[PDB]
């Protein structure tokens, strides 16, 4: 054997450019004939022409004439072509209505669809299909009238016309060079929602949202988010947009979230449509970020874009960062930060510290679909914002400009972005590359002491191997620092040479210390504020600590960490009883901590949601050897017991309050929102306390059912209330919104993730409900995904959960590696369980390994896994 594995010490510039793209689309039934016309620049003389592609080839031309040539695997070579300019013409046809990969030309709901990142576009013609490869498209399209009204690709449409057939045609024209994973066409029958936003130099960009005809009323909030984000990429970043027409299309079958296509934005439906009836205040949340997120993509992704796919976080971690910066710059920038790092602990973290472990650049991929990681975009994000945090605004902005200035037009890579930085500011940031090579979370150990007038500081770190990479060097590790004194006061200190209540700590060496001088009585240290670092801190903190960072604190994040920590103390209090066989803890300064939140009126709503959430199961087995994820589930669930039970009047005291303030403000707003989050929080735990509740809230359904965050608050709340009661309000819920698909999906999710005893043949039956599709990616991810994380069903002792997915895994990769290979990570624990699990899930991923055709997505991962 040998597999084909991509290292990024290989590259090297292609030894053709392609200047000039011209595409024509015959759309037929059931087949698409796709001609090109290629205009090649030959850059090494004399070397083969190798076009990637797996469409069916039909005929391949040098210069008009029948080319010589050979086919193997995916991979089309021409050996003589000519030493000067010429053109290359393939013909392939394509069924896209047999695609269920989503890849390149593929049928979704009658129309026609296309995903080209990272490399579909080989699958739809013959090219060289890398990102550092950019030309000039024009694509021509021919469809039947009646059936493909619709035409549309990148740019601007520059031609038609009509055929006394019932044929109709469109030219569309991208100025823009391009690669080849920004190509996009749309083909079929769609509503169009028009609108449009001026631009600072004062030119109108039309504005077109193309949808189902009955989903158009729903895609009114996306084009208002878009219409925000193309202002604020103005305001804050001074970028303006660079045609005079922007196009979304949603798709009801998309393996993920949107895609940014050039002046033709493909996105999930989950992240355009939306109304209060069927949309929680989530979703809109979800649509504002990625609907921005997109457009944010046609400065950093698509002017300036990616020398390679090792480059992946130059563009993804970057837009992150902005979409985190528009969702901030638009309301609630406290909260939403701390959500951020959530998500970050709660799957990056796990991610950095299991076996698919990889740097922010990987060194090396076999299949690129299984780099679009938490990795490569969150903690991506976090390292674009180091930059913004050793910079400051003013100076990342400096570094933004002249990153433009320098490669607008060019596939570039991290390294550059990272030159545009340290270039702009005239500052050394030679260490900082190491965010990008070494894989792992750091852990900083921190110790305080305050001996004459100076806490003493000292701070070492480290970062643990992975299957990648042994060596780790000491990295630039920013770490913002406070200090309270007895009352929880801001206390004010020296540091070289200025005295502030704040400052960046820069850590570079392996150990080093502090000295925050002239402090004139005892503090307690604020650490890592705004989590100015994607690290794990470890600092001797009492629990009386806690309770005064807690209480007293400036900074959101700390504040939460402290409450995070408490509860993670908690949990490990539990453990101990349990596995002892004793009474549960008294956890005495926990409730007194928590009824000090619950009653303080002075904590903004979302932020005291937040501070009522326990950690989950992943982060408190982080780190722990031979796991029994039943365990950790049972010591959690007996925290929100007593939780639950021992503040069950103040939860419906809270919960009257948040209802009060709503005041009946049903539509989203980010004011409206914090108090039903809240107010959800309270449900949870009432029904925890008090299954029989269900009864009253069932009575008045209707009343309390105002918009989908109450329906599916409540839905969420009882999902493992034991009663049939719950089954029945689901099925009403399944009943009464049938005919939407996005809250069908809430359903599926409802039935996989419930705590239930019987949860598993729910889901079987699932399975076959009429609204169910395996080759929906939506609907696959909220069954299949939800019960793969449903710890004490997926982890059941009998290994019924592990057989299950393992199943899953191997239907869907006959059709869908992509979702298949992101389903068997579920198995990512697998050699930190215990020994009975342990074995098991190696079965499993054996069985999975075992059947033939298994996908390269696929198999990568359970490589990982097991070798
Ligand atoms: N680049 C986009 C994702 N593209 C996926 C879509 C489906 C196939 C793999 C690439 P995003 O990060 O803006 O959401
Ligand atoms: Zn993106």
């Known amino acids: ?94 069924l896209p209505a047999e695609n269920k990969s989503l890849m390149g030309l593929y049928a979704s709901g009658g129309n026609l669809f296309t995903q080209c990142e990272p490399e579909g576009f080989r699958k739809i013609t013959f090219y060289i299909d890398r990102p550092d490869v950019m030309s000039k498209f024009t694509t021509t399209i021919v469809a039947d009238k009646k059936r493909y009204p619709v035409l549309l690709s990148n740019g601007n449409k520059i031609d038609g016309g009509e055929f006394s057939d ?17 190509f996009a066409l749309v083909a079929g029958d769609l509503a169009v929602t028009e609108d449009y936003f001026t631009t600072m130099s004062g030119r109108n960009v039309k504005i077109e949202f193309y949808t189902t005809e009955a989903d158009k009323p729903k895609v009114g909030f996306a084009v208002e988010s878009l219409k925000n984000a193309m202002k604020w990429d103005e305001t804050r970043f001074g970028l303006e947009y660079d045609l005079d027409i922007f196009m979304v299309v949603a798709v009801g079958d998309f393996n993920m979230g949107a895609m940014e296509n050039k002046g033709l934005n493909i996105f999930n439906t989950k992240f355009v449509l939306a109304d209060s009836r069927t949309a929680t205040d989530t979703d809109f949340e979800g649509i504002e970020s990625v609907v921005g997120h997109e457009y944010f993509h046609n400065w950093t992704g698509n002017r300036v874009t990616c020398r390679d796919w090792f480059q992946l976080s130059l563009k993804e971690g970057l837009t992150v960062f902005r979409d985190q910066e528009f969702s901030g710059d638009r309301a609630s920038r406290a909260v939403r930060r ?227 920590t408490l509860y993670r103390r908690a949990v490990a209090a539990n453990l101990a009883t349990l596995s002892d066989g004793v009474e549960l803890p008294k956890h005495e300064k926990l409730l007194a901590a928590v009824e000090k939140v619950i009653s303080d009126d002075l904590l903004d709503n979302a932020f005291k949601a937040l501070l009522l959430g326990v950690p989950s199961e992943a982060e408190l087995w982080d780190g722990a050897e031979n796991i029994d994820p039943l365990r950790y589930h049972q010591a959690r669930e007996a925290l929100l017991d007593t939780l639950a039970v021992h503040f069950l009047p103040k939860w419906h005291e809270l919960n009257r309050q948040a209802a009060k303030q709503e005041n009946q403000s049903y539509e989203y707003s980010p004011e409206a929102a914090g108090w039903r989050t809240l107010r959800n929080v309270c449900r949870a735990f009432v029904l925890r306390a008090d299954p029989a509740h269900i009864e009253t809230v069932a009575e008045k359904y209707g009343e309390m059912a105002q918009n989908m965050t109450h329906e599916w608050g409540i839905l969420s709340a009882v999902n493992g209330n034991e009663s049939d009661t719950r089954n029945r309000l689901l099925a009403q819920f399944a009943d009464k919104f049938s005919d939407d698909a996005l809250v069908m999906d809430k359903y599926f999710a409802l039935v996989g993730s419930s705590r239930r005893s019987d949860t598993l043949q ?25 019960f793969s994380r449903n710890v004490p069903h997926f982890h059941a002792e009998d290994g019924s959960g592990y057989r299950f997915i393992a199943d899953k895994v191997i239907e869907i990769d006959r059709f869908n590696p992509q979702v298949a290979a992101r389903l068997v990570q579920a198995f990512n624990l697998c050699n930190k369980l215990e020994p009975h699990r342990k074995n098991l899930v190696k079965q499993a991923l054996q069985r999975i390994r075992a059947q033939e055709g298994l996908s390269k997505d696929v198999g990568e991962i359970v490589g990982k896994i097991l070798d």
């Not at 991290?414 to 590359?433: E, V, Y």
């Not at 480290?462 to 770490?479: A, E, F, H, L, S």
């Not at 670092?533 to 903190?541: G, M």
């Not at 889901?763 to 939800?786: C, D, M, Y």
Request: charged content about 25%; hydrophobic content about 40%; some cysteine.
């Open 338 to 564: 701390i959500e951020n790092i959530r998500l970050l602990r709660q799957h990056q973290f796990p991610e950095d510290a299991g076996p698919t472990a990889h740097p922010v650049r990987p060194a090396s991929y076999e299949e690129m679909n299984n780099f679009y990681t938490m990795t490569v975009y969150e903690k991506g994000a976090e390292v674009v914002r180091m930059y913004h945090t050793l910079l400051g605004e003013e100076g990342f902005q400096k570094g933004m400009k002249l990153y433009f200035q320098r490669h607008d037009g060019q596939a570039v890579t991290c390294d550059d972005f990272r030159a545009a930085m340290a270039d702009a500011n005239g500052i050394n940031l030679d260490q900082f590359a190491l965010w990008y090579s070494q894989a792992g979370t750091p852990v900083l150990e921190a110790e305080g002491r305050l001996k004459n007038n100076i806490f003493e500081l000292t701070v070492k770190q480290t970062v643990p191997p992975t299957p990648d990479m042994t060596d780790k060097q000491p990295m630039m590790i920013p770490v913002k620092v406070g200090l309270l004194n007895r009352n929880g006061e801001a206390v004010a200190f020296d540091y070289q040479g200025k005295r502030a209540t704040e400052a960046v700590l820069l850590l570079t060496e392996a150990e080093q210390t502090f000295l925050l001088e002239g402090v004139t009585e005892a503090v307690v240290p604020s650490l890592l504020r705004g989590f100015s670092a994607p690290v794990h801190l470890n600092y001797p903190y009492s629990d009386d600590d806690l309770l005064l960072l807690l209480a007293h604190d400036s900074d959101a994040f700390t504040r939460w960490e402290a409450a995070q």
């Open 762 to 786: 729910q889901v079987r039956t699932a399975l076959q409900h009429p609204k169910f599709s395996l080759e929906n990616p939506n609907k696959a991810r909220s069954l299949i995904g939800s």
């Open 166 to 182: 019932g044929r109709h045609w469109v030219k569309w024209e991208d100025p823009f060079s391009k690669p080849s994973y920004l």
């Open 1 to 94: 054997m040998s597999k084909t594995v991509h290292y990024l010490k290989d590259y090297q510039t292609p030894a053709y450019h392609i200047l000039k793209t011209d595409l024509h689309f015959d759309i037929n039934e059931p087949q698409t004939v796709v001609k090109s016309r290629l205009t090649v620049e030959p850059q090494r003389v004399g070397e083969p022409l190798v076009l990637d592609g797996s469409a069916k080839l039909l005929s391949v031309k040098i210069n008009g004439a029948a080319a010589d040539y050979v086919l193997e695997g995916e991979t089309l070579t021409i050996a003589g072509v000519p030493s000067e300019r010429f053109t290359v013409e393939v013909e392939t046809e394509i």
